[PDB]
Structure 1
Amino acid sequence: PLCANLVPVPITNATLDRITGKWFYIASAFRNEEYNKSVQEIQATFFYFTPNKTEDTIFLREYQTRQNQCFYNSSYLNVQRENGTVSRYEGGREHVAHLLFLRDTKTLMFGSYLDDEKNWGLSFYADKPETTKEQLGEFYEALDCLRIPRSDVMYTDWKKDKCEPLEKQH
């Protein structure tokens, strides 16, 4: 069953435990042009999830590299458990994404606009800044499911990261 993992899955405390920690933004692709535009500029990103299960929020410490600068932000994501989504209002708009999983327990994906063939996309994250060819195939196989060509994928370059020195300064 190839595209079974693109179906929404409710978020439990176990799910929240699973995503607790440091993750690295690996790659994404979208049919939505706004997200293509903003995500293009991303050279690298790592981040921390610290869920508050009682509040259905996730504390986010984000370390983004664009134009060879480090942009650091903290904020809370809201969790909508039945729907398997997480959200965050930012720069005017509410953003929502489905939390989706691959077979590799060391990776995760966020799904944007999943209900819309004109706008859908997937972003891929791993617990290392570099991914194995196995992890990357599971991600491509999820793109294949959304009929998004592999050549549309935007990648981070862990060579380009400027945030390590701030995260340690923290």
Structure 2
Amino acid sequence: IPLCANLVPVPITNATLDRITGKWFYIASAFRNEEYNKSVQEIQATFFYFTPNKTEDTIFLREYQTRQNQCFYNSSYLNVQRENGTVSRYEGGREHVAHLLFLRDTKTLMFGSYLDDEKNWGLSFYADKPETTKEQLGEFYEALDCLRIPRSDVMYTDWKKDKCEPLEKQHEKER
């Protein structure tokens, strides 16, 4: 099985939307795009919820980000472009598009940014737990290997640093 196979766009079905539904933890990312490297540098932890709306091709996103030892919560909707296998988010006068990609491990997922551009591409890595196994991490490294991004360029979260669970639990009461 060739290295790049899981870096090819895959159309998103209802089944794909079911598979991504729920809580994910941000594990790691690496990009050649400087803007993304800059934004991500400062993220210490992040977890999020996806609630797809299959009929509107949107996904409701609730996001719990830790930067500078404090909790920033945002909710918004992503749009789904099923055929291209991408999801998009409007983030300040700009639509941002990412390819939804998969690894052998069904408890992970990744998003590819600027995948058609060798000067800007990158990958972000997510798991259903804030800790990953060495198998999950190797799959991610292999994907980076395909983009010729060295492993040493990877930026990681630190689940020790999460400042957001006290907000998530406070949100659970109301909902």
User: Scaled by the length of structure 2, what TM-score is found?
Assistant: 0.97
Once the two structures are TM-superposed, the CA of residue 150 in structure 1 deviates from its matched residue by 0.2
Segments ≥4 residues shifted beyond 2 Å: none
1:122-163 alpha-carbon deviations (Å, 9 max, x no partner): 000000001000000000000000000000000000000000
The percent of aligned pairs where both chains have the same amino acid is 100
1:85-141 alpha-carbon deviations (Å, 9 max, x no partner): 000111221100000000000000000000000000000000000100000000000
CA distance in 2, matches of 1:71, 1:94: 21
Once the two structures are TM-superposed, the CA of residue 3 in structure 1 deviates from its matched residue by 1.3
SS at match of 2:3: coil
Once the two structures are TM-superposed, the CA of residue 20 in structure 1 deviates from its matched residue by 0.1
CA distance in 2, matches of 1:98, 1:49: 15
CA distance in 2, matches of 1:157, 1:91: 27
User: Scaled by the length of structure 1, what TM-score is found?
Assistant: 0.99
Q: How many residue pairs are counted as aligned between the two chains?
A: 170
1:33-89 alpha-carbon deviations (Å, 9 max, x no partner): 000000000000000000000000000000000000100000000000000000011
SS at match of 1:4: helix
CA distance in 2, matches of 1:33, 1:90: 16
SS at match of 2:43: coil
Give ranges in structure 2 of 5+ residues lacking alignment: none
Once the two structures are TM-superposed, the CA of residue 2 in structure 1 deviates from its matched residue by 1.6
SS at match of 1:3: helix
Alignment of 1:116-135 (within 5 A): 116-135=117-136
CA distance in 2, matches of 1:92, 1:167: 28
Once the two structures are TM-superposed, the CA of residue 26 in structure 1 deviates from its matched residue by 0.2
CA distance in 2, matches of 1:53, 1:28: 28
Q: Which residue of 2 aligns with 1:24?
A: 25
